[PDB]
Structure 1
Amino acid sequence: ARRLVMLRHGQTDRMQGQLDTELSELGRTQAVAAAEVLGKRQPLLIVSSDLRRAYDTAVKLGERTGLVVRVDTRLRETHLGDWQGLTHAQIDADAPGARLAWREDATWAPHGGESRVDVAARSRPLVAELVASEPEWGGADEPDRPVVLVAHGGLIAALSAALLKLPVANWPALGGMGNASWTQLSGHWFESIRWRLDVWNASAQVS
């Protein structure tokens, strides 16, 4: 069994998407806490979104583990198109039912943005590459050491649902990840690997 951990950063300084928002100082200390916790699981590898709220969180885990943090733009949050930088009120004022529809339809995207299906399509190949290129992952010697992806709430829900092979209609069953939270899937005996959900949205600040 290959363990795959996905970590969502803490507090930041209104739709963000791929805008490059910063962690607050609280968010920075939450990254430290998350590093202390996830560091005890001894990660095999760390891959991070290039967006600083994710990357700055990953760097603390890298410092705790002595691992490099590989960066990969395929882990970027959903691009939210015209919504980016807008408040809920502003979006609701142009389309009263849009945010609701979005939440309930994994194929729906804001104008100029990505749907959950798009985000899964672009991120899923990263996981396949890792299965192919990291024989230690779930290998005989240290089978429990997890690959850690440091990313975003939208990405994590989309990619998890895709790996679990849920039908598209059921992808909205996965709620939103909180601040400094983690999720874990395990892949059991790429295409023939069967993934199951071990943990969804547990706090990473505490163990």
Structure 2
Amino acid sequence: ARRLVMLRHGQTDYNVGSRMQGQLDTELSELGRTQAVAAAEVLGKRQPLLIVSSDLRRAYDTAVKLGERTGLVVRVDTRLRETHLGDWQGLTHAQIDADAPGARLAWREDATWAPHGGESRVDVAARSRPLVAELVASEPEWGGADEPDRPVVLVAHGGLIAALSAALLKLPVANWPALGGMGNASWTQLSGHWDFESIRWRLDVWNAS
């Protein structure tokens, strides 16, 4: 079995202000940096095989602390970026609700709906799922005989993680909103048991702190 760990970036100042980011490249807050230190310790002990991060700095900075704790290089991939949120980037929840009452809630319940200029959950899965497939192909050590519990660690964002997870689990799109919201520096683990499609993923942990 292949263990896949997915870590949401630590707290940013925008998170503190309930302000939407998307692919705006915001900074970790001080608290966010200490969160990343704490998470690296926990995940470091699990002895990751590999670290792949979103190139957005809030994720990348989170990933670098795990790299320091484990002596692994941090690989970077734009396909792990958070959902592009188009017109909503830079606005707060309150601001969005004032303009479009009910649009946020509606967005949340429809995995095919994108904000104007942005991405849907389905779009994000379409870019991120093949990356997991590439790592299955490129990392023979993963779930291999020697050390089969050593996880691949993807460091990213909450939207990306829900989308990628639902897609790996092969939930129908209509059910993707069943997956909730990750905490800052919280993680999710899937296991892939066994062609890439033949892999059967299950959810071991959603949103551990």
> Aligned to 2:190, what secondary structure does the other structure show?
strand
Instruction: Provide the alpha-carbon RMSD of the alignment.
Output: 0.6
Question: Quick one: distance in 1 between partners of 2:6 and 2:12?
Answer: 18
- Give me the TM-score of the superposition, normalised by structure 1: 0.97
Question: Quick one: distance in 1 between partners of 2:9 and 2:78?
Answer: 16
> Aligned to 1:58, what secondary structure does the other structure show?
helix
1:46 positional shift: 0.2
Question: Quick one: distance in 1 between partners of 2:39 and 2:27?
Answer: 17
Q: Which residue of 2 aligns with 1:10?
A: 10
1:66 positional shift: 0.5
Question: Quick one: distance in 1 between partners of 2:9 and 2:24?
Answer: 15
1:89 positional shift: 2.0
Q: Which runs of 5 or more structure 1 residues have no equivalent in the other structure? A: none
Question: Quick one: distance in 1 between partners of 2:140 and 2:101?
Answer: 49
1:94 positional shift: 2.1
1:132 positional shift: 0.4
Q: Which residue of 2 aligns with 1:201?
A: 207
Question: Sequence identity of aligned pairs in percent?
Answer: 100
CA distances 1:44-99 after superposition (whole Å, capped 9, x unpaired): 00000000110001000001110000000000000000000011122122211210
Pick one of 192, 197, 200 that aligns with 1:191: 197
Instruction: Give matches, 1:14-163, under 5 Å.
Output: 14-163=19-168
1:25 positional shift: 1.1
Question: Quick one: distance in 2 between partners of 1:90 and 1:31?
Answer: 29
CA distances 1:84-130 after superposition (whole Å, capped 9, x unpaired): 00111221222112101101000011000000000000000100000
Question: Quick one: distance in 1 between partners of 2:144 and 2:94?
Answer: 50
Moved over 3 A (4+): none
